[PDB]
Amino acid sequence: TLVPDLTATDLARHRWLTDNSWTRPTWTVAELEAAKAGRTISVVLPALNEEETVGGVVETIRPLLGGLVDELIVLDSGSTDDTEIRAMAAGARVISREVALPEVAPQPGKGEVLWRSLAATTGDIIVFIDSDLIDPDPMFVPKLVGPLLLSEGVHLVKGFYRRGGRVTELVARPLLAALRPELTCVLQPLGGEYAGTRELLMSVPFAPGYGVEIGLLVDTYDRLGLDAIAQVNLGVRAHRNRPLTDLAAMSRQVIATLFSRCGVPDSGVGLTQFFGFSPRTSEVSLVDRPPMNTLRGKLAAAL
Amino acid sequence: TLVPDLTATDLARHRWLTDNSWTRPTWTVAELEAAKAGRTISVVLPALNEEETVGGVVETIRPLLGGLVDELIVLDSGSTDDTEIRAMAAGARVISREVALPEVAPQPGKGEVLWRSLAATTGDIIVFIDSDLIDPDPMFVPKLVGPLLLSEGVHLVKGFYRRGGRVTELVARPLLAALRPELTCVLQPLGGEYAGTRELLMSVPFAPGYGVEIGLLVDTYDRLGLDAIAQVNLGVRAHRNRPLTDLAAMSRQVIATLFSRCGVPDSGVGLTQFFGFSPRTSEVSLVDRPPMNTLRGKLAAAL
Ligand SMILES: Nc1ccc(C(=O)O)cc1
Ligand SMILES: Nc1ccc(C(=O)O)cc1
Ligand SMILES: [Cl-]
Ligand SMILES: [Cl-]
Ligand SMILES: [Cl-]
Ligand SMILES: [Cl-]
Ligand SMILES: [Cl-]
Ligand SMILES: [Cl-]
Ligand SMILES: [Cl-]
Ligand SMILES: [Cl-]
Ligand SMILES: [Cl-]
Ligand SMILES: [Cl-]
Description:
- Two copies of one chain form a homodimer.
- By secondary structure, chain A is an alpha/beta fold.
- Helix content of chain A is 35%, strand content 16%.
- In chain A, helix 11 runs parallel beside helix 12 (244-261).
- The relative contact order of chain A is 0.14.
- At the A-B interface, helix 1, helix 9, helix 12, strand 9 and strand 10 of A face helix 1, helix 9, helix 12, strand 9 and strand 10 of B.
- Chains A, B: Pfam families: Glycos_transf_2.
């Protein structure tokens, strides 16, 4: 809604950018592990057909398994390439969507995968890391759990890179300025590298498809306020030059998910693209998976 | 609002793409001039500091002056370079914002310029052409007025190019799919080359800044329906590689203007961009210029 008391100038000077934003995190693995205090950490990599990169991501994380990290899972989304065997060969446990939650038939898209991984994991903290990363850094998981383990009151940590992204810069952040202005303090709201506490994640809906990350950001903000969110610098990463046609369909789902969270009536109509004319249509989903907490008791595996 | 009866598939197969969309316009200047039937045509080029390109755009249009075109005006927006003298030297009349409407102090931005040009022009049809075009084609004005002069019931003509644009493809068209799905049939809703009848243009508000084009599209659609809009192929044009930082600020104003037209409460908060951090803020306007018709009677020059 209309917030004429807030300006872009005092968003740039917002105290949150100091106390909840780590440009140069200096935490050690040993001192993070010391702060677990009986909490466990689950790392989840969503994956659909990522055979060329999934092993390299898993290998950056595997040395933490059994110390800082308690579970390392690739949640496979129906890959037909060698994603699964390569993740296993790299030292990760691989769980299909069906095995994560066999009572419920899979919907397509990324959010489904992350939602199901709540039923497959046991960590008090869950870290999500994209499996398509071309050059992952082994300090990702430590930097993401830093504010959860050491700060107070943080429940969602968003990892950003110094160069980000055409959808992030033209779609997500300008819409947040219009609909959730305080969230413009988040550098990369769509980023795939982030960590959350279990109670938070079990009690929010998961948006479908590519809306999942911005949906968690906005639901966490709405539920707990800006102080409960933090961001940390993961380092440098090259913008993978994705086709604008793919980015357009993803943008449409980002819009749908944000409108869904902000009371904006979305038409539900998918995006048409023209290239006479050669038309290309995509679909968009307006239906969340409900909070996983609502399924407690009905599951053959406890939550 | 929610339109679950419409899908992206039947938008791609929409009859409008045949009867109101000209992929290969074949009109001659002589036969268009024959159809004027006493209507006059005003061509308007908005311009702020366009000394390198404005003359070349004017020269592509000047041979039509006195035949198909009755007025050729560059509406200068406070240029400090040689925009004005170069437009004059190319054969255009140059009118400042103040001379267009001296009773009202200028607001910044492009929409202000186009709104003021309604008071400075006399054509029954007004054609807007950007002055920063690097390679304008002399058939722009004929192709834009074709459907106005020959078809029935068209009041707004949008000229598109075969390659368009990151803001168009990731922001404008996906938001239209969410908020005004039928308008996704328009290939380039933000395009600067378009023509409109005077009665229509005098009776709609003009959005400020870079929102002006999408605001006219949505107001025309809301007021008169999709049949009153048409689009024509102008040919090929190179995407001028504008900085993503500029595109982000323009996207924010596009969003504000669309939310303004579609009942979506916009925060009014400008876009912050970060590059410690180096913050960069822009402003956004939620205030239209009212329909120029509302100022009739109060102007020292008649409308
Ligand atoms: N079904 C899908 C599962 C995962 C992903 C992804 O990780 O980007 C995308 C689609
Ligand atoms: N004040 C302005 C006037 C004109 C333009 C433009 O034509 O892009 C931009 C700004
Ligand atoms: Cl502001
Ligand atoms: Cl800091
Ligand atoms: Cl089901
Ligand atoms: Cl992006
Ligand atoms: Cl919580
Ligand atoms: Cl659809
Ligand atoms: Cl046609
Ligand atoms: Cl004034
Ligand atoms: Cl564009
Ligand atoms: Cl009208």
